[PDB]
Amino acid sequence: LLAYLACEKENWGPHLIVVPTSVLLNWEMEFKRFAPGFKVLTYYGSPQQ
DNA sequence: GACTAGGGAGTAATCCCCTTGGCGGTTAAAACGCGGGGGACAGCGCGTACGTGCGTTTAAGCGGTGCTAGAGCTGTCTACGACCAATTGAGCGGCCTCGGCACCGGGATTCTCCAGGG
């Protein structure tokens, strides 16, 4: 769905994926193996980083 | 005068929202440990600034005096302050905003360390 929105429409602005903690890595890998044309951010890991 | 009709209280069933405990998940603050280095402190030397003895004087205590202007108490009155309430407005009790505060980001600016040569 997001890939279709990014291809058919010129809008691929910052979207949010709210997920449980356990799948936090899996999602960023889910379209790493799959469509990699997006820039993914992972938010976790102490205040510093 | 005998019995009739209707509605809010008495009795009761419904709802249902409100919390008592325990337990798991997850982030943040607290807890612990090492390399190394800068702060604490000894050993010491000294000089010069006081610690101390003695001469030679001004000065507080001494001893007394003659009063002098400010301080305590005696009437005495009278201007004023603590005694009811009508008031009626100065101001507080409860609610509704939008704005300054909360707080984080991009950047310019600034504060600090080093391994070398200069």
Curated annotation (Swiss-Prot):
It comes from the Eukaryota. It is found in: Nucleus. Catalytic component of the SWR1 complex which mediates the ATP-dependent exchange of histone H2A for the H2A variant HZT1 leading to transcriptional regulation of selected genes by chromatin remodeling. Component of the SWR1 chromatin-remodeling complex composed of at least ACT1, ARP4, RVB1, RVB2, ARP6, YAF9, VPS71, VPS72, SWC3, SWC4, SWC5, SWC7 and SWR1, and perhaps BDF1. Present with 656 molecules/cell in log phase SD medium. Belongs to the SNF2/RAD54 helicase family. SWR1 subfamily. This is Helicase SWR1. It comes from Saccharomyces cerevisiae (strain ATCC 204508 / S288c) (Baker's yeast). The gene is SWR1. The chain holds residues 734 to 782 of 1514 of the full protein.
